[PDB]
């Protein structure tokens, strides 16, 4: 059944599972035409498929050519997502295939279930959590590889960098979701927090800066402040 606050630690047990987020698959800019009508222009997108225990991110880049000559693109995007997730699963050795796939949006349930009919033992689940994975394109290195792609491409990342050498996967996921929630609520502020101190750099093979344990506590506090504030600024409190 659905994943929620009550069964949260299940994410960090030893049953392989993946989150799939489709919110950045079909992306457009909306603009005026010379005749003064409105049109859209697609830009490259991505499927966000994440193992929350290990941090392994399977970033399937969706190049705009996949939309050429197609209709009802927002519907197609869900089915394209499910096609690519099913292909990923089939590409993995049996012992690496997930036992559950959790979709962040309920409209992915039927597309994914249908594409995974060959895998009756893989549970496809929704979630009641409001996860901030749409903000993945606010991570500079992820946005860069998506925007530069000239063809369909899969790129592999660990979204936890080396954090698991020092913290558990529960704590790493909590840090990830805090960072992403902040980037979603106020991207400029969030990014200012992460980079204000030029002596803390991002390793070439990492996504986030090389904070010490003590610096992560300061950073994490600053992201909470931001979120509560924006929550005031937004609601006036």
């Amino acid at each position: 059944g659905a994943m929620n606050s009550s069964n949260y630690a299940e994410l960090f047990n030893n049953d392989i599972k993946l989150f799939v987020d489709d919110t950045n698959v079909y992306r457009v800019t909306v603009h005026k035409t010379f005749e003064g009508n409105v049109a859209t222009k697609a830009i490259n997108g991505c499927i966000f498929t994440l193992n929350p225990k290990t941090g392994h991110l399977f970033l399937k880049i969706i190049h705009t050519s996949v939309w050429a000559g197609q209709k009802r693109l927002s519907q197609l995007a869900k089915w394209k997502t499910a096609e690519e997730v099913s292909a990923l699963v089939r590409s993995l050795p049996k012992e690496e295939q997930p036992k559950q796939i959790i979709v962040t949006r309920k409209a992915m349930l039927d597309p994914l279930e249908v594409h995974m009919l060959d895998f009756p033992n893989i549970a496809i689940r929704p979630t009641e959590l409001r996860l901030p994975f749409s903000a993945a394109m606010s991570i500079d290195k992820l946005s860069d590889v998506v925007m530069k792609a000239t063809e369909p491409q899969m790129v592999l990342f660990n979204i936890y960098d080396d954090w698991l050498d020092r913290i558990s996967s529960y704590t790493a996921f909590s840090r990830l979701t805090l960072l992403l929630r902040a980037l979603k609520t106020n991207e400029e502020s969030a990014k200012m927090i992460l980079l204000s101190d030029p002596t803390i750099t991002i390793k070439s093979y990492h996504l986030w800066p090389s904070f010490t344990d003590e610096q992560w506590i300061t950073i994490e506090s600053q992201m909470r402040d931001l979120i509560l504030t924006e929550y005031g600024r937004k609601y006036n409190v």
């Binding site: 279930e113 249908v114 060959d118």
Partner: protein, 300 residues
């Protein structure tokens, strides 16, 4: 015109014959039903006064044998049986006829309701859905589950309707996932019509039989089957024009006949709203849409 005699009526019971019904009192000198139209299947059905639980009954065709009803005090129900001695049967019926204890199947001459509800229903197909090969007639009751319900527990007593499942490998061609799920024409026309049912008449017959078991016995799995077979047609973009026209007539007469007060349980809101207002065939069921809107606008 054929006859189904009753040995007696030892317990108070409401007796149905097709869309008609009589309340028989405990030990009411009553001895069966005459003037039953030849050429159609028929259903004789029962609800005891002391236990409105379990409606049950028998599908039959008088061309296939001489059938009668006899109460069994051990099993506690009215049982259909075949009389193989034809002279014994004619003699019984004639005596019963002279005693004026046999009700006359009360068909109005103008009235094509039963034909319209059973147009494609054949006894031979009923007997493959309801498996009990030593009898020529078929028992159904309120509690019997379908083969598909059992999958999700006694198989001898199951309704072996054709399994329809929209999220199944049978329904979905590898590589056409989105196409086959959003437009079920492949599944309707190739898998089901050409493959399993062979023709639309057999498909409609199973649909009509499922409705009738839903209506007369409150059989929940039958209701599920009826709606699935409707939904499979309505969710196909490509349906033969003769099938859509016949479907509209079939459904019109089903909706017309349904008891006004059972609509809440026998009609699935999602399927009907999808079929009449969203599906590919939303504009192909004019008669059905008009009667639904005028009789059950709440559901919609």
């Amino acid at each position: 015109m054929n006859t189904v005699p009753f040995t007696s009526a030892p317990i108070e019971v409401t007796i149905g014959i097709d869309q008609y019904s009589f309340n028989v009192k405990e030990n009411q000198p009553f001895h069966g039903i005459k003037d039953i139209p030849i050429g159609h299947v028929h259903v004789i059905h029962f609800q005891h006064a002391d236990n409105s639980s379990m409606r049950y009954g028998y599908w039959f065709d008088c061309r296939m044998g001489n059938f009668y009803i006899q109460y069994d005090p051990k099993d506690g129900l009215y049982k259909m049986m075949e009389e193989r001695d034809g002279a014994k049967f004619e003699n019984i019926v004639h005596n019963f006829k002279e005693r004026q204890m046999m009700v006359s199947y009360p068909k109005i001459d103008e009235d094509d309701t039963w034909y319209n509800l059973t147009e494609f229903v054949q006894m031979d197909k009923i007997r493959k859905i309801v498996r009990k090969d030593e009898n020529q007639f078929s028992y159904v009751d309120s509690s019997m589950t379908t083969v598909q319900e059992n999958e999700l527990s006694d198989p001898a007593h199951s309704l072996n309707y054709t399994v329809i499942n929209f999220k199944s490998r049978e329904a979905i061609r590898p590589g056409h996932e989105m196409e086959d799920f959003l437009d079920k024409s492949y599944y309707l026309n190739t898998v089901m019509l050409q493959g399993i049912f062979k023709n639309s008449s057999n498909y409609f017959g199973e649909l009509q039989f499922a409705f009738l078991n839903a209506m007369f016995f409150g059989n929940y799995g039958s209701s599920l089957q009826w709606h699935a077979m409707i939904e499979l047609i309505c969710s196909s973009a490509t349906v033969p024009k003769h099938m859509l026209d016949k479907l509209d007539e079939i459904l019109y007469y089903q909706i017309k006949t349904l008891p006004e007060q059972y609509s809440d349980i026998l009609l699935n809101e999602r399927v009907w709203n999808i079929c009449l207002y969203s599906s590919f065939q939303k504009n192909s069921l004019h008669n059905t849409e008009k009667i639904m809107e005028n009789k059950y606008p709440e559901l919609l």
